[PDB]
Every structure is written in structure tokens, then in C-alpha cells.
Structure 1
């Protein structure tokens, strides 16, 4: 599958969910990128204008792609694999209630999963992997990638 062929990757937060404080959205997304830069040669930088590699969007229902959202529950977010244009972009369903903690749906944990897709990972069959396809809260302050996630990403980078 596709991978980024450069080490400096940019992201941009297109818009902000009203569910959270702005600074908390920024921090959750930054921390999620750091999870992956920790285990690859990739470097991620936030930009505020122009075209980023990875555009982060909060949207509800139909929102201009083939992965229409479905209201509260069900699909929480989705992301495109590496490539030009919409490639890399990560979309979060605004019909969820995003949080910094164990209430609602944790943005950081969901972003770690989606960014995994943005970098070219697929799903894992291992329930302990962040790339497992059902959300579960785990303490975000002590979060660590599973061995399965590390093997997955290091098959693509580094």
C-alpha cells in the first residue's frame, strides 16, 4: 500500500469541534502525531494556511466524500491513506462528543488510530492494538502503542 516518500509531513486543522476547548483540540492532535513520530523517522508540523499533507476536519453526515457519516455512534472518524489531495486527510464525525478524557469519545485516541491510516496502516485483528477497529478508552496519560502497532508502522517506515 501507499506510504509517504518524504520525512517532513505537514498537517492543518481545518476547523474545530465546539465540543472541546480550542487548545485541547490542538494538543490532542499534536500528541497523536507524536505517538507515530516516536517510532518512525517522520516529523510533523502544524501549518495554519495553504495545503497541508494531512488535513484534519470535523464534519457531520455527507461532507464531500464517499464515507458519509452516520450521526452519533457507528463510524466515529475515517482517514485516507497517503497520497495527493484528499490522501492523508483525517475526518472526525461532529455528531460524536469529543473529549480530553474518558467521557464521550476521546479525540487523542481516535486521532492516533486515524493518523495510523493517514500514514498507510490498515486494521489489526489484535484487540490490544490502537489499529483495532473498535474504540475503547485506555488511560491517555500512560498510553503506549502495542507491539503490533509498532511492527505495523515499522514495516512501512524507518
Structure 2
């Protein structure tokens, strides 16, 4: 298997906030996305508002300091680094997308669930029902659930 966090208590911090959405709505989407993974593993996530965190959540555009520049509107929506120090774990969202609560634009929550999967050590799935399948598709958020493949994947890494 690939890198995993060698601890079950994992911190995150939101570096900055997209202007596409209300700040409260970003906080909510991210909290909910971590909860999805916490709900099927022994992992515990703690939000920090200031200081050192394992997973940094970042909205940025174009070339943004890592060796993986974003590409404008469309195309690549987001990327994340697997567990490790520094940029390890970090989840980056392309600000040239239009981030949403809803079905229009790109849903932050669903994209974050995907991204968070990578920040925890998952790669892509070949199951089209899996949140880790590498195509963005809106599905009703109130009824969203991880597929059986996603749960096998993450439980193979933790627990």
C-alpha cells in the first residue's frame, strides 16, 4: 500500500476561502467531507484555525507553488498529496472552477470527499459508483454515500 498517516488523530486547517461561496458553506462542506471518512474508519479529524495542521486545504489558481500547476476553468478541478510531512496530505482546489453547494458548477463537498480520500492515501477507483472514480459527477448530496469499493479501500489502509 501507499503512504498512510501513522496516527489516527489527524488535523486539518482551511488556508483560504473561495469567494464563490459563503465562508460558512465552505466550512460546512469540508467538515462534512471529513465526516464521511471518519464514519467508516477509526480516524478522528480536528479542525485547527491557526497553526500546524496535517491536511492544509487551499484554493489557488494556475501555478501555485507545488510542481502541479492548475489549468484554468474545467480540466483538472483539484488535486491532493498523500500522507507525509509538509505538503503531504494537502488538498488543493482550482479557484478557476466555480465552487458550489449544489448541482451547478462544481460541488465542493463531493470534490472534497474525493480529495480527502487522496489526502488519506487512496488512489483512484475503477468502480464508477465510487467517490474515488476520477470523473466529477453531481449526485444528490443529502443522499450521497461512499460505495462499497471506497469503504474497502479506506479500511484496507486504516483499522
2: CA distance between counterparts of 1:52 and 1:142? 30
1: CA distance between counterparts of 2:32 and 2:77? 19
Q: Which string of whole-angstrom CA distances, capped at 9 and with x for unpartnered residues, describes residues 106-133 of structure 1?
A: 0000000000000000000111100000
- TM norm structure 2: 0.99
1: CA distance between counterparts of 2:109 and 2:103? 11
- TM norm structure 1: 0.99
Q: Which string of whole-angstrom CA distances, capped at 9 and with x for unpartnered residues, describes residues 8-44 of structure 1?
A: 1100000000000000000000000000000001010
The aligned length equals: 158
5+ unaligned residues in a row in structure 1: which ranges? none
Q: Which string of whole-angstrom CA distances, capped at 9 and with x for unpartnered residues, describes residues 86-145 of structure 1?
A: 000000000000000001000000000000000000000111100000000000111110
Stretches of 4+ moved more than 2 A in 1?
none
2: CA distance between counterparts of 1:65 and 1:83? 15
5+ unaligned residues in a row in structure 2: which ranges? none
- The root-mean-square deviation of aligned C-alpha atoms, in Å, is 0.4
Aligned residue for 2:151? Answer: 150
1: CA distance between counterparts of 2:36 and 2:71? 28
